[PDB]
């Protein structure tokens, strides 16, 4: 697939909250470590593997207005590009809206366009060696390890957008026209009482992936609850890749992670019928509540293991995923996740 913006994956995710001390604990429970402090702003860098999470507590700024609206949330998203000048000019030619971010003496002039819910989308062409943006804009803490391993999360795998009815098409067009993303798959998920629809959008770099979710015709489901609780469209869950989910599970549990309620025993009993010869240790999945899906087509096994945290920032939750030959998404996991969140809505008295 052609890549006109020269997209080379996710660079960083940015966070903001109206209440001081609410994001720090979250990041620590998820295995992240504070590693540097911006040189003139009140913004901090948290890291795990190659994941860069930016904590922005800058007063009177884009981030502080965004957090007064949405609560604790993802307030920015940066993609890596080959050439920021070229990619920023191309996006303005194609109709994107520019966002100006102020900087101090000797800091970089990072370009950005408006994205989901007003959150900036940054186009960064300075990464990896020599000097990354963090080497120039930030000051590393005295003595800290600058590349912590944490609980094994490596890179950002994918993130979702929960959108109002009729806007799945709008956000598909945004990423199709500006970045040449493509609809890799379409889902129609039904729970016991409610349901949803989704389009899994993939970027041409084969790294950035963004599932776009919208409520069903019925209404009363989890997508509509998100939209009310977040006060608009936004990133509903962020997913981190790991090379070994059970091991990561054990490490997150030790430090305070809170996962979703596991599926019933029935689910684990039907795995072999559904995925003949998967090969995974059912005993270890079922003890942890891990979901298993993918295909088994004449010897060729492509699997997907997924597990979700409870909501931790307003309505936003996180996901720890391990791919074994499957580069897409799976309908059974999606359905399990969906039934889990629907039971919680009954539990809480908000549905039927």
């Amino acid at each position: 697939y052609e890549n006109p913006m020269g997209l080379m994956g996710f660079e960083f995710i940015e966070f903001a909250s109206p209440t001081p001390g609410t994001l720090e604990p979250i990041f620590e429970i998820m295995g992240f470590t504070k590693v540097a402090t911006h040189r003139s702003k009140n913004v901090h860098l948290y890291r795990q593997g190659e994941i860069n999470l930016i904590l922005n507590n800058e007063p009177n700024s884009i981030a502080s207005y965004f957090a007064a609206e949405h609560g604790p949330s993802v307030c920015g998203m940066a993609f890596r590009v080959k050439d920021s000048q070229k990619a920023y000019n191309r996006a303005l030619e194609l109709g994107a809206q520019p966002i100006h971010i102020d900087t101090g003496p000797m800091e970089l002039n990072l370009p950005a366009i408006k994205g989901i819910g007003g959150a900036p989308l940054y186009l960064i062409d300075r990464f990896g060696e020599g000097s990354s943006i963090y080497d120039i804009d930030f000051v590393y803490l005295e003595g800290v390890e600058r590349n912590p391993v944490g609980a094994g999360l490596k890179v950002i795998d994918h993130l979702t957008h929960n959108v109002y009815r009729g806007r799945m098409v709008y956000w598909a067009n945004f990423y199709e026209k500006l970045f040449n993303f493509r609809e890799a798959r379409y889902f129609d998920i039904k729970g016991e009482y409610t349901g949803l629809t989704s389009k899994a959008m993939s970027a041409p770099d084969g790294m950035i992936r963004i599932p776009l979710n919208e409520e069903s015709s019925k209404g009363a489901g989890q997508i509509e609850e998100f939209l009310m609780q977040f006060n608009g469209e936004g990133i509903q869950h962020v997913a981190f890749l790991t090379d070994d989910l059970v091991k990561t599970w054990d490490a997150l549990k030790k430090i305070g992670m809170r996962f979703m309620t596991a599926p019933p025993d029935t689910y684990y009993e039907m795995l072999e019928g559904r995925l003949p010869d998967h090969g995974e240790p059912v005993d270890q999945l079922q003890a942890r509540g891990i979901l298993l899906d993918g295909s088994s087509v004449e010897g060729d096994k492509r699997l997907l293991l997924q597990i979700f945290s409870e909501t931790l920032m307003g309505p936003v939750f996180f996901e720890f995923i391990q791919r074994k030959g499957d580069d897409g998404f799976g309908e059974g996991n999606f359905k399990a996740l969906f039934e889990s969140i629907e039971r919680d809505q009954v539990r809480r008295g908000v549905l039927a």
Copy 2:
């Protein structure tokens, strides 16, 4: 009611569209005349009575980005205030987000904050005589009458906001906190198959009024259909005051106005039951499809006459109102409006 910003009424409404030549004919059909052109931008002043409508076709600006998103629409609103510097500074202390608008040589530096759907909310303290803002920022057309009467519309009476489920509270708070509006009345309107809920918000000047509308629990109605068609929250209808609605209705009709479908004969038959001694010429109302409402309490009659155009700007429609003692809104008129739009939904095949 206390007025801490020193509000003094609406100053102007601003409109944009992505296709050139779509707004001119709508203004012309409502009785407005073009009277001036801005001195450096591609923006035009349309007037009737004391109503000032600004047509903004300035390329690569706030208004062009807003119209690419929403279609023909209301992209800006200005309020009259006693001292712009004090009101602007008090907004900014109470959390409002400032919006910067570029200006050329010798033009006014108009202050604004972000409002409904991102549309700027201006805070103007130079009006009336001596020089208004149109005297300084616009050049009147050679020989045109600078104060046209048109079809009789006088001032902007009110305008609505159609919001997403759960956001009526959000917008009520925005106006209560920054300007001290108050909820003057609550409505719960039910059609044949659908319904809505609304809060009529009143500013402390007794001039600015903004009903806030949201869809019912059942969904599928007209508010949800506006949100999808508009691509977000926005001003659903703008109402203009007239001192004589049957005369304004005849004027409007001559120059092409397209009004909604009238109520059935049954409605006009029940008027005397419901409003004993109203004193209005039923024969005139009924042939035009005008709606009559208010109260008849012990000889004190406080009436409201309303009529609505078809949708003219995407899903946005306009209202022509005459007040005869009633300063608020009427439930019976709200119902008939709602039932009429509901029947149109059924006719277009979008409802049940």
Copy 3:
């Protein structure tokens, strides 16, 4: 004479000083009254007749930086123009360097270019009729008379520029090229020990006149002394037109004005020789030290009456002039002014 920029006279002169309370007393001793205070800045409006003098005590601004360098001085100058947008854009196409001035809510965006010594040159197209720039940017003092008469000064007649050797040509070019001024007359003035050279530059409106002064080959004179005491090129004296100089002289005297030392009695004895039939009351001139000059060509008498204060603002001095048919300058008066300042040098010990 063609007028491409639409010049229409002087609009205002701006002053600054590094010591608080040094300019106030000098304005009051020349007949000016404070009449308004800016709406957001620490800047005050001083007025007499149609002369507007702006006292700028704005901290951390162009004016504060300029006064730190030069001492009490003229830091700005504004010209009236027909259309600011056209004039400003023509200036920028002919190489003029733009100067941005910040402004608060609802204030005018005044365009300016760099002029003598970096002092901004404003281009104002809003004067007289309806609302001036003082009506929009300033708040008049409770109950003070908005148009005071003072001591009879009416308008700014002219103002000089003292320049470095070789820069008369440079400043003549600047005004010729941008506004089409012309060299109306050239002077070569010699004292007892020193001398100077000067180009009287005239604008195409018949109102703005700027004499440009430079030191002679000999050096050690009064222009060189100004340039060291002022710390650069700048406006050396500002002249105010009056319709009656002996009356203004009496008024100025009563409020504290200090005038230069008078010419010796010889001067007044030779007036008839030099200007047969001048017709002026020699007895009144001689008792006040007024200078008289011009021509007497076969009946046609074009006279000039001039008087100069002592230096009041570092090396800057002021002039009170009455024109009786002569629209230019006089060589005899220039010489007497020169000889008087030369004797002052000798008196202070700085010359020979």
Copy 4:
């Protein structure tokens, strides 16, 4: 000596011209090589040893207005500091005037204040390895040697400021107050008909040195000539250090350098009388026109070898210097330089 600004030497010098292709040849004759091109502006990097010379040909900027006024010249100067935030803040607290420079996406925000004649003075704290400003803001040419040796010029030694009469004190205070420079020496140089006065200011880092030059009482000399031809105050000559002047002379000669007329034979005949035991090969210096000075105090020899280029950019000339134990300036060399420029004045017909 205390160093409050944390000064650590010169970082770069910047040049502009109104005529294209006038600076490229000058740099090439002086042994410099073009090594990179800015990533978004029309600015180019030239290098020799640790010397970085920036060629700024960016339209409608500070540089293009500065060049229209002064002709080919030094338009910018950058010092190295430990912390640009701290140094920039300290300089604004002490009265310096800020200068804003526009930058593109992912470029550094370089801070600067106003210096000699308006030319910016940059405060850069990013140098040496990791990434210098050139690694971030520029794009190295494909295949070129990034660190060329040229003719041996190592670093910038010093540079002068020619100032108007009475401004030696002004510029002395500027550097004393902001950066704590000190007057290391004072010269009073007389030629045959004219003379000058000078203060050698030294920075506390013992690297930055700036001799300040002003015309004598007599007038008509070479400083006054510079001021007219440059159209104001500015950098009259820039000096480059070399470890071997005779070998640098030979390589400069080869590629096109034009040196001043050497001193008469008489001057070399007297060297031994004035500097007993200097030890330098007089044959090699006299054939090349190199100037020799310093001291010979009981065995301890501190020498200075200097040679000057003809004027190459308007009235600006260059110096190639070798220090042999003398960290200051020499009065004989200054006098010989002065006599040489004076004779050229007589040759050209501008003096007596």
